Design a binder for these strands. Structure first.
Ligand SMILES: Nc1ncnc2c1ncn2[C@@H]1O[C@H](CSCC[C@H](N)C(=O)O)[C@@H](O)[C@H]1O
Ligand SMILES: Nc1ncnc2c1ncn2[C@@H]1O[C@H](CSCC[C@H](N)C(=O)O)[C@@H](O)[C@H]1O
Lengths: 230, 375, 375, 231
RNA sequence: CCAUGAGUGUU
RNA sequence: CCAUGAGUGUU
RNA sequence: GCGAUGGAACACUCAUGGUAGACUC
RNA sequence: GAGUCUGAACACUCAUGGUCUUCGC
């Protein structure tokens, strides 16, 4: 049962205390009474919140592992590569609210079938069934964004991220890049992969800000925050 | 000279420095704009683009979609392609405002409301098109058919244990699951077995002799009719499953001849569809090199070896190809590499709708396998 | 003081030093000797032994099978039991010659010919007696029921993927597999869905209108009647399998109420039969301690924690007990220990045919569960 | 693959077959010509049929390959076989001891004896006993004393069961072949420790240790000890 | 096979 | 789950 | 040996990526 | 980037063992 919900240090990201001692991250629900993936809806002082499972959402994991600054805030415009079935982008939609925008790119039709259910209720989310290797296939729909958030299982994921930044990320914007080591090279040690991919980024004029290991929320995953210098 | 911008907004003509030269706004029709986005993906210019350039009469057009260059050149324009140009970023950084100026939308809310219905409609259409691909039907069918085979074997193993309580000698005498389930379905109590009733089911006289001899000597227990009837439910289910298995196999034959006749000519419809299932689609199968096709289905062995450094697999699911699994171990690598080579060709011909050469691929392979068996 | 030897060849009375005092030779009858061997392992003396001891009138009798001591005492003799006595070793080292001396057999070859047929007939009768145990039937039935459950789930998962090509929104609208299979079986093309046909099948108005609305707006593909018929083959199999499952579960109720009523009173026929299946038999289940019963079915976690020192499992297949799996994790250990303790008692009542106390064991257990939850 | 020759080995009635692939495989002379037991290959050579003896499925063949110096199972031998299972190894014991030898096969799982029964029906050599090895008072009424006690039972106290059957049935100065199944005795322990503990128990019961053979790789976590019974 | 996302059955 | 024995299916 | 306490039940489906070693051009 | 050569395909059923910690009597 809910003791209290108060705002954390990051805009529109909240923390809920429960009487059994638990603490859980949550966001204010853009679509009250509707859950996305079976998460708990929390009511406190009129307002409804959605608990944000960090074992299913890399952004929530990154926050619980010490993400210092979060470029995703109210009114942010986000290009989301790898939108999948909607779990993390639904919370992104909560945080950014109606005046922010989340363009969601995902190339698997089987999973966009579910993402469309999330997008239908959130005028915030623009689903694009498209291949992130080919930003020419959705430049006709999107605009330039403050944040590029990339979580695609591809061996050249970092190059794909960089390519989309040249199209769409404002200069001095930010990139949150998930590095999925077993999807880049399953034979290599993830620690090496992280070093290698960040090297790419800094070679492409991305000022590294922070690198976060996602264990235990995700095995063999890191997430990188960089500022795109142009 | 002029930078062509094509967007949901319409077509917009820009200078070297980012100043709108001219524009034509798209109609606010969801159907029309999605159709033009779909078209524009295979390079067809927006009809608004065609009216724009006819008005602007440009000296050189920089576009952002490479497939569009021949399309516009065929209209009589000088065309170059440029990815993530400075000008198209300047355009994208001035949305949503530029949609109000060129009067596609009355205000920001109006613009984003339309864009949102647009993305939904665009996505629904790309989902419908993906669902129309007929290779999906072969894939589901052969996955279902493999579930059925596994189930037939699971239930037949159970029935043999369960019915052996009453008639244990039958197990070793009847190797064929379908015949074993037939005996249990038809008779139940081993006391009901007779020459004529077994003959009537199609057994030959020597087999019928061995069976009636075992039933008479049987060390098995006496059970009730209700006990026998619980067993016959499994046997009848097995019989029904073989009938579905054969229907599915006939269904799969017609779909695979339609979807991938050249692959089917080489490996048959079931094994052909398993290659599709593991690849994910015919288009995916036709991108793979022979050496990947060769080990489709062997992902556990391959990655075990890729880690430990152990011995890699010589074949994936193509081990089901008779000349592979019925040949000696030392010949199998070479045969699998010959089959993978023809599969890769067959898949490309099927994915690009080339002329049927599958029977000739088969002859080339049969003769190449003949070369190898001299070992 | 006499050492009684009881063997296939008959009953021999030996003095303390290995000398034959007297003997009675069994008849050369496979059926008779086999029956007397079976009675004897239960302590029942040979009919030849009875005849022999009356002849010898011993002062004391040493027997080889301890179960026989009370039976010979009830005949008026002083009797003791000696394991692997020297005299019985002297008897056995004098075979096969002693079998010729007491005229049970003409020669060695005759003796071993008969001994071989005896061992086969002895082994055959024990195999028959083992197969006659009623708990074997419960164990097979619940195993086939678990295959059926696994299969129903596997086919239903495949059907949803397959039919979703044509009607993808139905998957999230109908969560029960039997209803999903029912809709596919009855209608096929989502076009054929009407209000009253769906009413026929028992759906309610609110659900029916969601289904019809989704079918109108569906972005699923259009496919042939023959494509739908292949799907409906899996649907109808699913529905046949649910009917088999229910008939089997009703069969299992009958057997378990007869084979282990006390166990059935605590956990139901299906969970009780799973315990029998993992333990191997009611007799084995009744030898186990509560702590072992508690984790039957969790051997993977158990031995992982033994070999790594990790955390052991709190429950095995009894996790299926509703009061365990619907309870908060911090109570399950206590709850599972309380259930396991009642199951150990119940298994022993059933195995040795004590008086039925299952109703009372269940009352005790549910009171203990109330105590636990009110911490 | 084609048979070059089959020659007798050091041990009586155990033969070694030679193939042109340069491989060798143990075999025995088939007591029942033209029948197989577990799918093994029937090998004809100079007018006599042999049965290939797969050391991966038979502890006794494996022990020979791993250096067993002497073999108490010869022709005419009388053997008590505890753990006869479905008949793989005992069928070869039957070939080696021939018609004048006797092999008493004790096995307590009815499911598997169903199969053993078929092997025995064709071999007068073999007397199948569906019986618990912990209960030698059962089969004492059928068997006789024996020159060899062969024990291969998965039981935590398999060694005590072997010793207890020996006091009933094994002649003084007869031999015990005891397979030590480390994982069926205690999975938590090192097999090498299990072997010393079990051999120590045998030597404490007046069994003289003749040879201890580790059976890897034909069987993992397995040893086999040949001991002489002193009485 | 590994990592990741989404789910089902015994319930 | 580990070791051991016997087998099955795609064939 | 008994008790109390502690404490990782199993069976599966889909989607994305990760695809070897030598030698020859 | 081609080629040749080397080279551990999958899915399962049954049977026998191996059943923790702590604290108390
Ligand atoms: N080239 C590509 N273009 C678009 N999506 C891609 C892609 N390659 C991989 N993906 C998608 O990347 C996804 C990784 S799963 C990511 C989970 C998601 N970010 C969440 O919020 O929960 C998969 O859905 C996969 O289909
Ligand atoms: N107490 C006991 N009495 C009789 N057999 C037993 C037993 N305990 C275990 N066994 C049997 O010992 C066997 C171990 S497998 C042995 C295989 C066989 N010796 C061969 O090489 O071919 C199993 O069949 C098991 O049922």
């Amino acid at each position: 049962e809910v003791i209290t919900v108060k705002q954390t240090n990051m805009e529109n990201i909240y923390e809920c205390e429960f009487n059994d001692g638990s603490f859980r991250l949550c966001t204010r629900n853009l679509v009250p009474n509707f859950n996305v993936y079976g998460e708990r809806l929390i009511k406190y002082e009129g307002v409804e919140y959605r608990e944000w499972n960090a074992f299913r959402s890399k952004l929530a994991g990154a926050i619980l592992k010490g993400l210092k600054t979060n470029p995703i805030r109210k009114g942010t415009k986000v290009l989301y590569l790898g939108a999948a079935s909607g779990t993390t982008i639904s919370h992104v939609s909560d945080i950014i609210e109606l005046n922010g925008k989340a363009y969601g790119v995902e190339f698997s039709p089987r999973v966009v079938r579910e993402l469309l259910l999330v997008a239908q209720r959130r005028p915030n989310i623009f689903p694009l069934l498209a291949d992130a290797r080919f930003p020419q296939s959705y430049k006709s729909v999107v605009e330039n964004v403050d944040v590029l958030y990339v979580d695609i299982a591809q061996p050249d994921q970092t190059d794909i991220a960089i390519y989309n930044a040249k199209f769409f990320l404002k200069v001095n914007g930010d990139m949150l890049l998930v590095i999925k080591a077993r999807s880049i090279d399953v034979t290599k040690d993830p620690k090496e992969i992280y070093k290698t991919e960040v090297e790419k980024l800094e070679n492409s004029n991305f000022e590294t800000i922070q690198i976060i290991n996602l264990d235990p929320y995700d095995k063999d995953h890191a997430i990188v925050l960089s500022k795109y210098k142009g | 000279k002029i930078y062509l911008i094509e967007h949901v907004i319409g077509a917009v003509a820009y200078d070297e420095n980012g100043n709108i030269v001219d524009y034509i706004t798209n109609p606010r029709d969801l159907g029309k704009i999605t159709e033009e986005l779909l078209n524009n993906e295979k390079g067809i210019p927006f009809s608004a683009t065609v009216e724009l350039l006819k008005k602007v009469n440009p000296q050189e057009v920089v576009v952002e979609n490479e497939a569009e260059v021949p399309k516009l050149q065929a209209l009589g324009y000088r065309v170059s392609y440029e990815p993530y140009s400075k000008v198209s970023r300047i355009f994208r950084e001035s949305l949503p405002k530029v949609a109000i100026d060129i009067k596609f939308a009355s205000n920001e809310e109006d613009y984003y409301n339309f864009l949102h219905e647009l993305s939904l409609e665009y996505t629904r259409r790309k989902l419908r098109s993906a669902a129309q691909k007929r290779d999906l039907l072969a894939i589901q069918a052969v996955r279902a058919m493999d579930d059925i085979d596994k189930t037939i074997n699971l239930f037949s193993e159970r029935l043999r244990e369960w019915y052996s309580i009453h008639f244990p000698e039958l197990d070793k005498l009847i190797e064929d699951h379908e015949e074993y389930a037939t005996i249990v379905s038809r008779f139940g109590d081993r006391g009901f077995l007779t020459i004529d009733s077994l003959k009537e089911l199609g057994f030959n006289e020597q087999r019928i002799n061995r069976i009636l001899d075992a039933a008479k000597k049987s060390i098995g227990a006496d059970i009730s009719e209700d006990d026998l009837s619980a067993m016959r439910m499994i046997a009848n289910t097995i019989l029904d499953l073989y009938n579905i298995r054969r229907n599915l196999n006939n269904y799969l034959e017609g779909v695979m001849k339609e979807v991938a006749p050249n692959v089917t000519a080489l490996v048959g419809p079931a094994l052909g569809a398993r290659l599709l299932s593991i690849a994910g689609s015919l288009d995916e199968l036709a991108k793979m090199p022979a050496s990947t096709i060769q080990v489709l289905g062997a992902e556990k062995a391959l990655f075990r070896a890729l880690r430990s450094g152990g011995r890699p697999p010589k074949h994936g699911i193509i081990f089901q190809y008779p000349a592979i699994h019925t040949s000696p171990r030392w010949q199998r690598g070479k045969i699998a590499r010959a089959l993978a080579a023809k599969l890769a060709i067959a898949a490309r011909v099927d994915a690009f709708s080339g002329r049927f050469i599958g029977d000739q691929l088969n002859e080339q392979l049969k003769k190449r396998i003949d070369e190898i068996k001299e070992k």
